[PDB]
């Protein structure tokens, strides 16, 4: 079913533009290959975690500009491009300005109205 | 609940080791008091460093 | 502020101390257990 | 008057029943009602990892006693040939289902159960008959003519 | 499939028991299991449906010549409340990938 | 015993720009073998990555324990990645050779 193994062209088929495939090592990759065998093997082995008491930066992003009505925790995947604040340098600016969708989806009713017209005339 | 605390407190006293024995001249002392002004005397600057140890 | 800086530093030092004293113990335990196992296998051979 | 009717009936199990109810294939040895992981039973014992009871495995290749790994039992486990079996074994004599090791409650205690592997399995070089849970005690030995390996059990202490 | 939505209109509206449409019958044990898998047999369906009662006798329809199931069985329990329980409960069930149907007779 | 929407792919964010794929493979390598991993090298997508495993339940245990997990000063955003969306950049083709092979080797 959906768990059927995949190919690198099939891999390039799913994800959108602008991402790179990485090996860090050949060795960590060999860890990933033994990982299957070691998912059984190293889970049966010594392991644990602990914490120490010690005194103590914290970045994060909502959607800031002026207002930008709120993003559900999932919708980030769609609207992530709006989160980054890089601005003012073509088509990428049309997709970027097209996030007025977000204003249609979530927001106050007036934002939905005005947004709706603005996208109609565009 | 508070009254149950009173009960834990009484039987807590009565379960102490040799608590009531006056044979050798032992002496028990109950002391009740308040901190008087406690809220009002907390120092904010200090309270900040004290909270930095916690959270 | 001074007390906080020096204090954090001191507790940190004490931390690396406790860790350093801990790892030696762990390795001693693993070596001990491995010895018990090797002795067990030897008792299995004879 | 040899066969009156050619079909008759069955009154027997169906392959899709036992199939669907156990699948990794279909497996055997569904866990009994008791089975519980060992770590949480060390939590009801009030035991941090220092004083906790963890069963570590020890390997010796049957020809040479002279670790390929070391295995915890704390995280039941399906001992089999390699994919289905979790505890895969390179031994060519192990049937596709060889045996199983289930921790049960009687206290949290380790148990070994043979699946009726065709060759059998030797315990302290003394085999056990199939289809009953056999408690294991620390330092006991397992080997799956057909024995290429050995195994030992250890509680974590010292 | 229509059953489960009748039980939802029966529970949602606060039908309150005896006016229940299992009181439609009161005379009948035998139940109808359609949409059954062809690999199934007597002992099996007995083992699954003796859950909610004790089944006295079931005649599963199996084509006379080939001698294989036509895909459904008429069953008979020892108890009616077992029938009411079984129709109202065991329905919309997955078996071997296919959802069986049950109802009175 | 799983929600259908989750998939073998996880979108992971709140990453540093210096972060190394060594830490990546190590950390994420707990739950199962990596199918592979991508990382945005592009001005907007820098700081984001996608992880893909040989099995879904791998990823399930991952998002279970890795939920809001920490690296450096950061708590990573761990979400199950969507499907479809932008795909057709690639095509459906190259089925003919492989299907001819399975039709040849096994003869079926």
From Swiss-Prot, chain A:
Covalent cross-link Glycyl lysine isopeptide (Lys-Gly) (interchain with G-Cter in SUMO1) as placed by the record, residue numbers: 20
PTMs per UniProt: Phosphorylated. Phosphorylation occurs concomitantly with the splicing catalytic steps. Citrullinated by PADI4.
Subcellular location(s) of the protein: Nucleus; Nucleus speckle
Annotated site residue numbers, Interaction with RNA: 73
Family of this protein: Belongs to the SF3B1 family.
Role, per record: Component of the 17S U2 SnRNP complex of the spliceosome, a large ribonucleoprotein complex that removes introns from transcribed pre-mRNAs. The 17S U2 SnRNP complex (1) directly participates in early spliceosome assembly and (2) mediates recognition of the intron branch site during pre-mRNA splicing by promoting the selection of the pre-mRNA branch-site adenosine, the nucleophile for the first step of splicing.
UniProt name for this protein: Splicing factor 3B subunit 1
Encoding gene (name): SF3B1
Swiss-Prot record, chain B:
Coiled coil spans: none
Tissue expression from the record: Widely expressed.
Localisation per UniProt entry: Nucleus; Nucleus speckle
Superkingdom, taxonomy of origin: Eukaryota
Pathological condition linked to this protein in its record: Retinitis pigmentosa 13: A retinal dystrophy belonging to the group of pigmentary retinopathies. Retinitis pigmentosa is characterized by retinal pigment deposits visible on fundus examination and primary loss of rod photoreceptor cells followed by secondary loss of cone photoreceptors. Patients typically have night vision blindness and loss of midperipheral visual field. As their condition progresses, they lose their far peripheral visual field and eventually central vision as well.
Domain note: The MPN (JAB/Mov34) domain mediates interaction with TSSC4 and SNRNP200. Has structural similarity with deubiquitinating enzymes, but lacks the residues that would bind the catalytic metal ion.
Protein name (Swiss-Prot/TrEMBL): Pre-mRNA-processing-splicing factor 8
Gene: PRPF8
Shown chain mapped onto the complete sequence: 947 to 1001 of 2335
Swiss-Prot record, chain D:
GO molecular function terms noted in the UniProt entry: mRNA binding; RNA binding; transcription regulator inhibitor activity
Localization annotation: Nucleus
Residue stretches making up the FHA domain: 77-128
Tissue specificity: Ubiquitous, with highest expression in heart and skeletal muscle.
Keyword Repeat in annotation: no
GO CC annotations on file: cytosol; nucleoplasm; nucleus; spliceosomal complex; U2 snRNP; U2-type precatalytic spliceosome
Gene Ontology BP annotations: miRNA processing; mRNA splicing, via spliceosome; negative regulation of canonical NF-kappaB signal transduction; U2-type prespliceosome assembly
Cross-link Glycyl lysine isopeptide (Lys-Gly) (interchain with G-Cter in SUMO2), sequence positions: 39
Record keywords: Coiled coil, Disease variant, Epilepsy, Isopeptide bond, mRNA processing, mRNA splicing, Nucleus, Phosphoprotein, RNA-mediated gene silencing, Spliceosome, Ubl conjugation
Sections of the chain in a coiled coil: 1-24
Phosphoserine: modified positions: 157
Biased composition regions of type Acidic residues, renumbered to the chain: 146-158
PTM per Swiss-Prot/TrEMBL: Degraded by the proteasome upon binding to the SMAD1/OAZ1/PSMB4 complex.
Biased composition (Basic and acidic residues): 29-41
Known disease link: Neurodevelopmental disorder with hypotonia, craniofacial abnormalities, and seizures: An autosomal recessive disease characterized by severe psychomotor retardation, intractable seizures, dysmorphic features, and a lumpy skull surface. Patients are hypotonic and have poor feeding in the neonatal period.
Protein name as catalogued: Smad nuclear-interacting protein 1
Gene name of the encoded protein: SNIP1
Swiss-Prot record, chain F:
Domain RRM: 8-83
Gene3D superfamilies xref list: 3.30.70.330
Cellular component GO terms held in the UniProt record: nucleoplasm; nucleus; spliceosomal complex; U12-type spliceosomal complex; U2 snRNP; U2-type spliceosomal complex
InterPro entries xrefs: Nucleotide-bd_a/b_plait_sf, RBD_domain_sf, RRM_dom, RRT5_SRSF_SR, SF3B6_RRM
Residues annotated with N6-acetyllysine modification: 18, 30
Keyword Nucleus (UniProt): yes
Pfam families named in the record: RRM_1
Single biological process term from Gene Ontology: U2-type prespliceosome assembly
Interaction with pre-mRNA branch site: annotated span: 5-18
Example of a GO MF term: RNA binding
Cross-link Glycyl lysine isopeptide (Lys-Gly) (interchain with G-Cter in SUMO2) placement: 18
SUPFAM superfamilies (alphabetical): RNA-binding domain, RBD
Localization (cell): Nucleus
PROSITE patterns: RRM
Chief location bin: nucleus
Keywords assigned by UniProt, alphabetized: Acetylation, Isopeptide bond, mRNA processing, mRNA splicing, Nucleus, RNA-binding, Spliceosome, Ubl conjugation
Keyword Mitochondrion: no
CDD domains named in the record: RRM_SF3B14
Subunit and interaction comment: Component of the 17S U2 SnRNP complex, a ribonucleoprotein complex that contains small nuclear RNA (snRNA) U2 and a number of specific proteins. Part of the SF3B subcomplex of the 17S U2 SnRNP complex. SF3B associates with the splicing subcomplex SF3A and a 12S RNA unit to form the U2 small nuclear ribonucleoproteins complex (U2 snRNP). Within the SF3B complex interacts directly with SF3B1. Component of the minor spliceosome, which splices U12-type introns.
Record family assignment: Belongs to the SF3B6 family.
Cited PANTHER family: RNA RECOGNITION MOTIF RRM DOMAIN CONTAINING PROTEIN (PTHR23003)
Protein's name according to its UniProt entry: Splicing factor 3B subunit 6
Natural source organism: Homo sapiens
Gene name tied to this protein: SF3B6
